[PDB]
Amino acid sequence: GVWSNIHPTDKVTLSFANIGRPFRLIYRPEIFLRDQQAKFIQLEKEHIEKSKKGEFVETTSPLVLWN
């Protein structure tokens, strides 16, 4: 309930299991991943624009991010 309402995981597990990991990763992992992928997002956008255009870029092809 209230004391654990901050996080779905239990308080004891939060206190002990998570050692050294960023609280940004523990809470709100999506924002952490998006910040990590910031440049990859623009690379993927440029790759999509070029693919719509005639050019096809193979260097950035693996960058297909969904989170």
């Binding site: 096809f56 193979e58 092809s61 693996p62 297909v64 969904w66 989170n67």
Partner: protein
């Protein structure tokens, strides 16, 4: 799975099992471990597209699952090591049938990814069996 039908069978349906080569098993395991991100992405994007344009009256109802095309192509390239084409549509004829089965599993029947990964791995295994030394 891993069962071959008996060509000369007294009854309608008979199957004899076979064990894939160690090289094939290693290749499939490594590629699954490396490209597991794309399969989860396919699942999540499928659910997202169904939620967004599931309703018939939705504006994007005519573009269903097209965004998942990039994920599917990326997964195919990752599994095949960027060889044998840069798109799923470029799959060889040996694995074309398995690719069609996978698409029916995923998008038409909307069956679990547990089920559809079987067909995707079947496509990969067919390509590997066809080539052998080309993938390793």
């Amino acid at each position: 799975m891993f069962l071959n039908p008996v060509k000369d069978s007294e009854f309608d349906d008979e199957v004899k099992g076979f064990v894939p080569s160690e090289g094939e098993v290693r290749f499939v395991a490594n590629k699954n471990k490396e490209c597991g991100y794309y399969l989860q992405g396919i699942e999540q994007c499928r659910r997202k597209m169904v939620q967004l344009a599931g309703d018939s009256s939705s504006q994007f109802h005519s573009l269903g699952f097209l965004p998942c095309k990039r994920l599917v192509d990326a997964h195919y390239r990752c599994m095949t090591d960027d060889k044998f084409g840069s798109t799923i549509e470029e799959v060889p004829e040996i694995g074309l049938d398995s690719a069609q089965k996978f698409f029916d599993c995923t998008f038409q029947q909307l069956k679990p990814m547990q089920s559809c990964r079987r067909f995707f791995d079947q496509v990969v295994r067919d390509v590997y069996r066809a080539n052998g030394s080309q993938l390793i």
